């Protein structure tokens, strides 16, 4: 019915008017490309050949467009159509008369998409504003869209079969709009959290931590090769940090050339000892933490997620706030190129040697588990004797579960800490966790020491069978193993019952992901529909479509969210 | 023992039997995170291999068969009953867990181009097209014949030379996209000759015809099935996964010279990023690499039953130490470009990698001024119909946040469904307009002078007309 057509989603009101299928759009699998800049995207030749951007013939560009017309559709840098002044369209594929090929001012030649053509790149779902950014086009000889790895974080995209949509603006006006509003370098900092959206990620973060260590010393030829990939190099080789006996540069010395202009920033490394700031060696840090950049030169410190990541006060954030968006784009690209070429010399790996720990550490983990199981047994025996006293506001069952969970959690964390102590400097799990590229201390603990308690619906594994978790356990068994505690690590391998309980926990995780996607989508749509028309007028009042004053000034201070920074008042706290 | 239960009534035959068919192919399942086993169960259904030994006889749509299937070097005992050895899906591949050039970052994979040249992960894609000569129509007969442009009033300019006399292309003839696989003609009633009814190849198939069959179907009409074969050499978009839930595309392909090489001369067929392992905690992958190295040197297929208690990482490591390699499986690698030893020692070992059905050639689509729908006069939908990608409501909200009003206007009006209507000034209702006659008149007012041209999306015109049919009057007044 008419109401049926209009009412539902995919109806005329929403499925054909608010959103609709569009021309000049392309889609294919995305794959990595560290060599492309932040703004560049790699477009396949077939996608580039099908998509055409109409160019008006001017006296300036008549020769170039004439050559494109002569090439035709077959040769790649060609023109699919000619649009005359009358509006007549001459498809060049079917034979055009040599008279038709002649061009005069006012004709519109539809050239194939070429390098440097601005496009809009999208990945569904388009949760936030950074999910649609304008990319310059670079044509490369394979059939996948190729984008830089730093740009993956705004899109929330990884290269495991993901796909993205390519929309080509078809007019100079809309092309200029994209160029000056939606380009990737222009949206490095989000107004949502006044932090940079994009940060150094994956191999480049892991390798920047290793590159910026005090240990790293580079010989002359390696410095040559690293400087070759620096786009903004002045052409002057820095004086080596160690002139004699053999000239040897340092990783910080080369990274200082990457840092844009003169940027001043102080951040702390992840492994910074808390006591260091108070005690001596505060400025001469023993562990080479406390990153300090003075006059755009890395005086000291080991770079990590905190310094080069997506957080407020990061080196990239200070670069965007101080140097500008263009120099910051060059900064991102140069970090990636130089560090990735040094990683060929150094290399990264993950093996079983990382998962395995010392025999003493294994014995310590086992002893912690033994005494934890004994403590849980003691709590159970107290409960059976009714000696246990209920916690206020909780039933005896709830307080028993609380105490048992506390004991098991304390043992789990202690075993994890023992495993983390066992890790050497060379351990690669620790390299990735310390750099912040991937993983966490929890993952290391589960890999090496103890997987941990499996919880479903906020409780230990429930009694699915009559008063027992699995048929193998005895009825009314509230012990650690029965209710889900996985003593073995992933490396050691889970026992079969622990395997089933672990599967139950993982299933809860998967279900939560599936549910959250839909519910969050509905919430986001409702918020947008409620606030879509609110905008800052030229009175600088924030008004809706009805012109009702939502706010007299935007944010009550009339400032945009991206420019602001965290600061301390310093008059508030001190005593009189 | 220390008394736990003295009244056992039954015993499990083996704990590994709790797993199903797809989960049984996972080696060392107990050493992986649970969501990763769940993901591998789904990925294994999409892997490529010889699906059945009678695949030559069968004419199925979308059949992929790998050139050189190999049985796993590290296999579960329950795989024998699944017949996985008989019909394997995947190739054991020398896999290095390393960061080489940054093209293996995220989940992507650097593959050896020389190995790909030697047959590594090469497959064939068979697509079958069925057509039926239907005489059921009263005066319509869908005869099989080669259409002729002069004889047939309805025809298309695609290539018709391939078709033989019967209207069916012969086996062994290359077919590029937009070529006529089957030529069929419907005789046209002469109300007062021919509307073309040929079937055309899916774009970019680029295959060679394998088998052409002519039979009579259940209805008794002549039935023709044509199978087109396309070889599929792996590319830099194809999706490859291991048995431990690690899926990823091919970032780039380097030749044997460029790939890092051990001292023995072994270059990894596949390089995967080290960053995939820690967050996902798929230690079973690492144990499979170690066991595969031991198995390849020893000559015995490794055992990876989930719960064994006789196979430990330490025992595998000692076994590998006997065969002359580092006990943890790391190997000293040399950089292919410069020859210098990589300072970190890379973890190299054979691992069973699979090739998933998802390939870039099937997933690449570009649209530019294509056909439009009838009802909405908007671009079509789907790769088969050359459909444009949808600019959803979330996309328009992002563009509003940008402030790109004119790009939003182009994308939502000018690119999709531009249209013009004539609207009376006195009454907002649309008015009849004869452009060729140059006379524009509005019914209901008997007014001709006051008419204005309005540019609106065709979908908006359709919406207003559907409102009018419900007796609502959407009077759009320019004033």
């Amino acid at each position: 019915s008419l109401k049926q057509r209009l009412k539902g989603k995919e109806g005329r009101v929403r499925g054909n008017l608010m959103g609709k299928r569009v021309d000049f759009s392309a889609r294919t699998v995305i794959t990595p490309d560290p060599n492309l800049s932040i703004d560049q995207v790699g477009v396949p030749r077939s996608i580039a050949a099908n998509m055409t951007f109409a160019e008006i013939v001017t006296p300036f560009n008549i020769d170039r467009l004439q050559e494109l017309v002569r090439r035709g559709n077959s040769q790649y840098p060609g023109a699919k159509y000619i649009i005359r002044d009358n509006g007549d369209r001459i498809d060049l594929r079917f034979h055009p008369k040599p008279s038709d090929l002649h061009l005069q001012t006012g004709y519109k030649v539809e050239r194939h998409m070429c390098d440097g053509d601005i496009v809009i790149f999208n990945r569904q779902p388009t949760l936030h504003k950074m999910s649609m950014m304008g990319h310059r086009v670079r044509i490369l000889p394979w059939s996948t869209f190729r984008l830089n790895l730093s740009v993956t974080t705004p899109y929330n995209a990884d290269f495991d079969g993901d796909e993205m949509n390519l929309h080509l603006p078809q007019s100079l006006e809309t092309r200029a709009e994209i160029q000056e509003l939606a380009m990737v370098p222009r949206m490095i900092v989000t107004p949502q959290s006044n932090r940079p959206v994009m940060g150094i990620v994956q191999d480049t973060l892991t390798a920047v931590r290793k590159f910026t260590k005090r240990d790293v010393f580079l010989e002359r030829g390696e410095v040559m090769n690293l400087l070759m990939f620096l786009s903004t190099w002045d052409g002057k080789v820095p004086q080596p940090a160690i002139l004699k006996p053999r000239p040897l540069w340092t990783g910080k010395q080369i990274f200082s050339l990457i840092i844009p202009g003169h940027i001043n920033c102080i951040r702390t490394h992840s492994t910074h000892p808390d006591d260091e700031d108070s005690g001596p060696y505060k400025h001469i840090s023993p562990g080479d933490t406390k990153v300090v950049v003075e006059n755009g030169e890395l005086i000291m410190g080991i770079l990590c997620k905190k310094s080069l990541g997506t957080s407020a006060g990061s080196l990239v954030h200070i670069s965007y706030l101080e140097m500008g968006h263009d120099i910051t784009r060059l900064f991102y690209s140069n970090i990636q190129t130089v560090i990735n070429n040094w990683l060929l010399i150094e290399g990264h790996t993950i093996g079983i040697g990382d998962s395995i720990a010392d025999s003493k550490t294994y014995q310590d983990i086992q002893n912690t588990i033994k005494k934890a199981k004994q403590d849980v047994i003691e709590v159970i025996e107290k409960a059976h004797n009714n000696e246990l006293e209920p916690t206020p506001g909780n039933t005896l069952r709830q307080t028993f579960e609380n105490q048992v969970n506390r004991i098991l959690n304390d043992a789990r964390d202690k075993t994890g800490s023992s495993a983390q102590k066992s890790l050497s400097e060379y351990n690669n799990f620790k390299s990735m966790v310390v750099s912040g590229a991937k993983g966490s201390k929890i993952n290391i603990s589960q890999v090496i020491a103890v997987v941990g308690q499996q919880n479903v619906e906020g409780k230990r594994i429930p009694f699915g069978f009559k008063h027992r978790t699995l048929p193998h356990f005895i009825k009314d068994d509230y012990g650690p193993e029965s209710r889900g505690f996985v003593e073995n690590s992933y490396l050691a391998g889970l026992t079969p019952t622990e395997f089933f309980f672990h599967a139950m926990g993982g299933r809860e995780g998967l279900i939560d992901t599936a549910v959250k996607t839909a519910e969050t989508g509905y919430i986001q749509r409702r918020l947008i529909k409620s606030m879509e028309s609110v905008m800052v007028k030229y009175d600088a009042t924030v008004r809706n479509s009805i012109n009702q004053v939502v706010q007299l000034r935007y944010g009550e201070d009339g400032l945009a969210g991206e420019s602001v920074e965290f600061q301390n008042l310093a008059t508030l706290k001190p005593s009189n | 023992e220390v008394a736990y239960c003295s009244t056992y009534t039954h015993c499990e035959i083996h704990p590994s039997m709790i797993l199903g068919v797809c989960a049984s192919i996972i080696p060392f399942p107990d050493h992986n995170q649970s969501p990763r086993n769940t993901y591998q169960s789904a990925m294994g259904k999409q892997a490529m291999g010889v699906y059945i030994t009678n695949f030559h006889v069968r004419m199925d749509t979308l059949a992929h068969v790998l050139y050189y299937p190999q049985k796993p070097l590290v296999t579960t005992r329950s795989m024998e009953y699944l017949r996985f050895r008989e019909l394997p899906a995947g190739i054991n591949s020398i896999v290095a867990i390393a960061s080489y050039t940054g093209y293996n970052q995220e989940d992507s994979v650097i593959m050896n181009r020389s190995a790909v040249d030697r047959g590594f992960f090469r497959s064939v894609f068979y697509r079958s097209y069925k057509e039926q000569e239907s005489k059921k129509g009263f005066d319509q007969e869908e005869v099989f014949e080669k259409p002729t442009r002069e004889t047939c009033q309805g025809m298309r300019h695609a290539i018709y030379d391939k078709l033989d006399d019967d209207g069916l292309i012969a086996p062994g003839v290359r077919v590029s996209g937009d070529d006529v696989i089957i030529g069929k003609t419907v005789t046209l009633p002469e109300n007062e000759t021919k509307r073309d009814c040929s079937t055309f190849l899916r774009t970019s198939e680029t295959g060679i015809v394998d088998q052409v069959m002519v039979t009579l179907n259940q209805e008794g009409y002549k039935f023709c099935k044509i199978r087109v074969r396309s070889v599929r050499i792996p590319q830099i978009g194809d999706k490859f996964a291991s048995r431990h839930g690690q899926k990823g595309t091919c970032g780039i392909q380097y030749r044997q010279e460029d790939m890092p090489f051990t001292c023995e001369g072994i270059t990894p067929d596949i390089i995967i990023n080290p960053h995939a392992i820690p967050s996902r905690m798929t230690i079973g992958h690492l144990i499979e690499c170690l066991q595969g190295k031991v198995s390849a040197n020893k000559g015995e297929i490794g055992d990876a039953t989930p719960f064994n208690d006789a196979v430990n990482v330490q025992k595998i490591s000692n076994l590998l130490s006997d065969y002359g390699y580092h006990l943890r499986g790391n190997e000293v690698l040399y950089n292919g470009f410069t020859g210098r030893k990589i300072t970190s020692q890379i973890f190299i070992g054979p691992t069973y990698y699979q090739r998933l059905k998802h390939m870039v050639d099937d997933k690449i689509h570009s649209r530019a001024r294509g056909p439009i729908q009838i009802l909405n006069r908007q671009p079509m939908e789907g790769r088969s119909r050359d459909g444009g990608l949808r600019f959803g409501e979330m996309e328009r909200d992002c563009q509003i946040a940008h402030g790109a009003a004119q790009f939003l206007r182009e994308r939502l009006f000018e690119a999709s469904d531009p249209y013009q209507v004539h609207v009376c000034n006195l009454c907002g209702i649309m008015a009849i307009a004869n452009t060729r006659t140059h006379t524009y008149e509005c019914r209901g007012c008997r007014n001709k002078t006051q008419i204005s041209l309005v540019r609106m999306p065709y979908a908006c015109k359709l919406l207003f007309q559907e409102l009018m049919s419900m007796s609502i009057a959407p009077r759009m007044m320019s004033v």
Binding site: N405, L408, N409, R412, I442, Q446, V451, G452, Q453, Q454, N455, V456, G458, K459, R460, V486, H502, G505, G506, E508, G509, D512 | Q33, S34
Partner: peptide, 8 residues
């Protein structure tokens, strides 16, 4: 899969 306070 860790604990009651962590993740499943």
């Amino acid at each position: 899969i860790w604990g009651i306070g962590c993740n499943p």
